[PDB]
Amino acid sequence: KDAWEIPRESLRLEVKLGQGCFGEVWMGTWNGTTRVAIKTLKPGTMSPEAFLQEAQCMKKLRHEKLVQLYAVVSEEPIYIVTEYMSKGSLLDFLKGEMGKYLRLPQLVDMAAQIASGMAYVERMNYVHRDLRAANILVGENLVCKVADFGLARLIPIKWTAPEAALYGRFTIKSDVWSFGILLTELTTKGRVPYPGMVNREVLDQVERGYRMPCPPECPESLHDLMCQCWRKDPEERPTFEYLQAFLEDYFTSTEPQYQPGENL
Ligand SMILES: COCCn1c(/C=C(\C#N)C(=O)NC(C)C)c(-c2ccc(Cl)cc2)c2c(N)ncnc21
Numbered sequence: 001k002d003a004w005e006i007p008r009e010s011l012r013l014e015v016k017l018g019q020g021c022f023g024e025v026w027m028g029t030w031n032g033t034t035r036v037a038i039k040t041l042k043p044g045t046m047s048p049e050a051f052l053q054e055a056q057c058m059k060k061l062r063h064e065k066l067v068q069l070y071a072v073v074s075e076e077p078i079y080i081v082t083e084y085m086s087k088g089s090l091l092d093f094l095k096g097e098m099g100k101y102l103r104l105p106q107l108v109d110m111a112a113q114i115a116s117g118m119a120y121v122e123r124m125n126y127v128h129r130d131l132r133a134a135n136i137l138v139g140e141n142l143v144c145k146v147a148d149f150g151l152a153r154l155i156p157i158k159w160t161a162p163e164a165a166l167y168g169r170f171t172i173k174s175d176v177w178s179f180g181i182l183l184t185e186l187t188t189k190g191r192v193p194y195p196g197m198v199n200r201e202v203l204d205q206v207e208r209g210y211r212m213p214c215p216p217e218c219p220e221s222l223h224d225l226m227c228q229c230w231r232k233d234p235e236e237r238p239t240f241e242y243l244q245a246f247l248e249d250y251f252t253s254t255e256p257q258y259q260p261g262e263n264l
Contacts, residue, residue: 004059006071011079013038017088021045023077027084036070037085041078048076054150055080057126065117067137067147090136090144094190104219104264105251107186110136110144112247117146118179119240122172127153129170131178133185157199158192162206163234173234179243180229187218187264217261221254 015027023042030036041051058069058080071081087093090110094102114136121128128135128149135148153170161177163169184193193212194202211230214223225246231237238246251258 002072002074004055004069004072005074006081008073008079010071011036011038011073011081022051028081030070030081034070035084037082039080039082041076043077048074048078051078057149057152057154058082061121061124061126061149063117063120065113065143065145066120066149067145085137085139085145085147087138087140089134089147090138091133091185091190093138094133094186099189102189103260104187104258106142107264108222108247108250110138110142111183111186112244112250113144114146114182115179115240115244115247117144118175119244121146121149121152121175122240125155125172127155127170127172128175128178129153129164130156130159131175132156132159132182133190136182157202158194161234162203165203169234171234172240173237176229176237176239176243179240180226180237181212183222183226183229184212184215187215187222189263217264219255219258222250 010031012029012032013026014029016024017027017037018025021042022045023040026038026040028036028038052074055069055072062068067085068083069080070083073079087098093099118128118131126149128146129152130148131146135146137145137147139145157165159178159181161174164171164174181193185191197205209232211227214220225243228238229243246254
């Protein structure tokens with residue numbers, strides 16, 4: 001009942017990319033020509049009428065830093081068809097070898113791009129609710145794109161903002177918090193934040209006012225930007241417009257005398 005509906009013969013499932021509770025994720029080919037990604041759904045872990053919403057946001061939303069939807073199959077088992085991102089998740093990309101050599105200025109440019117994606121999500125009055133390195137996809141030329149916004153609002157503790165973790169206040173300002181934590185993944189080669197702490201002690205420590213220290217060999221001005229992202233009051237945090245502009249211009253405006261180090 002929709003112009004995103006497609007018959008099942010167009011999609012050749014080729015290669016297996018990731019296991020999940022929702023279901024698998026494949027590479028494939030659409031109509032013989034195009035290389036495409038395919039998120040699937042295993043019958044007994046979610047209903048057909050429920051997974052309708054995963055791609056409702058994707059239907060309405062289009063921007064160069066948002067993984068693009070090509071197609072769906074609403075009849076169960078469901079398949080969602082998107083652009084294939086060659087280099088996989090951003091987290092896998094930073095941890096493994098291809099980013100052993102990534103220095104600050106490749107990282108800051110990635111951040112500027114994700115932030116472009118989110119400033120568009122801001123401008124359209126949506127919320128991601130789940131921004132972190134495992135949901136960013138890297139592409140050819142280190143193009144980064146904001147990915148799994150299934151259950152993205154129309155109005156995981158370590159990444160989540162506390163007012164959201166606790167009271168369910170899931171705003172665009174709780175995405176600036178996350179994004180601030182995403183800045184600490186980039187600059188530590190994709191480690192887990194709050195190292196040597198478990199989900200339980202995180203919430204307590206955060207509300208006491210413990211923010212993460214400046215990761216080794218990272219410019220002070222960037223660690224400051226992380227602390228603006230994690231201000232206690234939602235409204236004292238900056239927006240995806242100012243972040244985008246800040247990181248784009250970073251090396252001219254804010255760090256012109258920056259010198260490379262060992263890790264950044
Ligand atoms: C090998 O890890 C990259 C797998 N991957 C995925 C899958 C995930 C991501 N991120 C995911 O759910 N978790 C990972 C298994 C950890 C997608 C994808 C994203 C959104 C939709 Cl709607 C359809 C598929 C994807 C893509 N478009 N291109 C290349 N790789 C992709």
